[PDB]
DNA sequence: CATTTAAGACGTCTTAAATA
DNA sequence: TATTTAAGACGTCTTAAATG
């Protein structure tokens, strides 16, 4: 399972468009997008912003533990 | 606090006695990658900075912001 | 509406060379 | 040996548009 399922996951569990979780984490919804298609994975800043926008760790994200 | 990333890497890094190649091979990235980091021409992408992060028993947080 | 695609700017890595 | 500089490959973002 890719990093960028666990984040839809979450965001969907969340019940947020990705604009939205763009706008928490500091980011474009287009960068939510790619992140989640796994066309790119978040750089340092962004992995940290979008795991507590996700209420998650980024071990979760990245590894799924 | 209000340094750069870059000079707390590199504190944290000299205070474990830790060389930046053998850092490097710790985190999964080459030596020059670490001299980047240090000197804040560079930030680590999301993956190295959690390896990064557990090869100085530091949070992510605090190399980051300091926080 | 809400998300993906496209193009392009700039960041994050690599090895080889230069430094001392 | 230890680190920085240089040059190049590919990655991570942006906005506008297209697709949904």
């Given at each position: 399972?890719?990093m ?8 969907k ?14 980011v ?38």
């Open positions: 399972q890719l960028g399922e666990r984040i839809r996951a979450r965001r569990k969340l019940k947020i468009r990705q604009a939205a979780l763009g706008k928490m984490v500091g474009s919804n287009v960068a939510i997008s790619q992140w989640e298609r796994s066309e790119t994975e978040p750089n340092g800043e962004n992995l940290l912003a979008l795991s507590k926008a996700l209420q998650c760790s980024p071990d979760y994200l990245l590894k799924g533990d």
